[PDB]
Amino acid sequence: EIVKEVLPLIRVYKDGTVERLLSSPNVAASPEDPETGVSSKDIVIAHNPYVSARIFLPNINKSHNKLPIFVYFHGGAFCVESAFSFFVHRYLNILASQANIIAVSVDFRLLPHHPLPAAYEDGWTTLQWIASHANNTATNPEPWLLNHADFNKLYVGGETSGANLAHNLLLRAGNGNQSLPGDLKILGGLLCCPFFWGSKPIGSEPVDEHEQSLAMKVWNLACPDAPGGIDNPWINPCVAGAPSLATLGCSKLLVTITGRDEFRDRDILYHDTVKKSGWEGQLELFDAGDEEHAFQLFKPETDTAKAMIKRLASFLV
Numbered sequence: 001e002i003v004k005e006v007l008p009l010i011r012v013y014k015d016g017t018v019e020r021l022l023s024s025p026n027v028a029a030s031p032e033d034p035e036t037g038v039s040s041k042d043i044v045i046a047h048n049p050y051v052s053a054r055i056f057l058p059n060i061n062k063s064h065n066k067l068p069i070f071v072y073f074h075g076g077a078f079c080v081e082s083a084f085s086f087f088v089h090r091y092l093n094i095l096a097s098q099a100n101i102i103a104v105s106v107d108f109r110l111l112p113h114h115p116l117p118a119a120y121e122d123g124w125t126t127l128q129w130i131a132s133h134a135n136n137t138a139t140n141p142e143p144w145l146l147n148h149a150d151f152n153k154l155y156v157g158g159e160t161s162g163a164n165l166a167h168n169l170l171l172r173a174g175n176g177n178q179s180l181p182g183d184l185k186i187l188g189g190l191l192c193c194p195f196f197w198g199s200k201p202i203g204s205e206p207v208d209e210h211e212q213s214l215a216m217k218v219w220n221l222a223c224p225d226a227p228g229g230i231d232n233p234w235i236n237p238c239v240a241g242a243p244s245l246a247t248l249g250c251s252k253l254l255v256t257i258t259g260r261d262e263f264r265d266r267d268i269l270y271h272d273t274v275k276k277s278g279w280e281g282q283l284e285l286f287d288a289g290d291e292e293h294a295f296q297l298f299k300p301e302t303d304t305a306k307a308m309i310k311r312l313a314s315f316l317v
Helices: 086-099 118-134 143-148 160-173 214-222 264-275 303-313
Strands: 002-006 010-013 018-020 039-047 050-057 067-073 102-107 149-159 188-192 252-257 282-287
Touching: 002 214, 039 118, 050 086, 050 118, 050 143, 067 086, 067 118, 067 160, 086 102, 086 303, 102 118, 102 143, 118 143, 118 149, 118 160, 143 149, 149 160, 160 188, 252 264, 252 303, 264 282
Parallel strands: 067 102, 067 149, 149 188, 188 252, 252 282
Antiparallel strands: 002 010, 010 018, 039 050, 050 102
């Protein structure tokens, strides 16, 4: 019997058995991906609360220099998708090889059982875990990080809800009484169609249906206790009295948008607010074209997807 529902994404029963939308099944890590040459391993970042990940290492054809790290958070409205899906595996294989970087695909906790800020906390745990490698305080070090990772080139990002998550990580890092082990800094933020919303319809957003929007339902499930509801700074970063976007804790920031994404105008407002917030870094915007959310993961062979991957490659640098 049904306790919660946010169709088409998720159904939760009295017993805590959950039906989720599943856009692709999980695939296994690979010693060497046939198409891209990227190696992957599944590792435990933390046992409790349980946080795992897949790490991606491109072909090591030269080893003069160490590689940028890209910590990636999948989308799925905080309640579906996976760090290990066919789509994410194949996508990060492409990115890792094209950009020549190490990728970390984070399997953070999801609704219904873990409301925000659980996912936020898991991302922070991930970053601490990475930074403890750099100052030699990691109890169970990943050799790939010790051997191939350039810790001065840490990038953090994702799609939609995952990009929202990265954004909140940036704010935490830019907070004064917050530090990573060894006071490690984040180089860059990559936010691809980030999930942001608000109580008032803006731009091309439908006016009357706004109260019934899927975003309202998703936010209520992810964080019902949130003060201000859909206007809480976690979901609406441009809301009055939110932390200033001048405190984003990186030095380069690329915001990615698309034509058919429901978050287009929110994303556009967000970038523009960062621009006039006083933030000091390299701020960039990329309009990926007439596409949906995350189109490049689904159709990586299109000219538009290839153009996006190329653009990202020149950013993750």
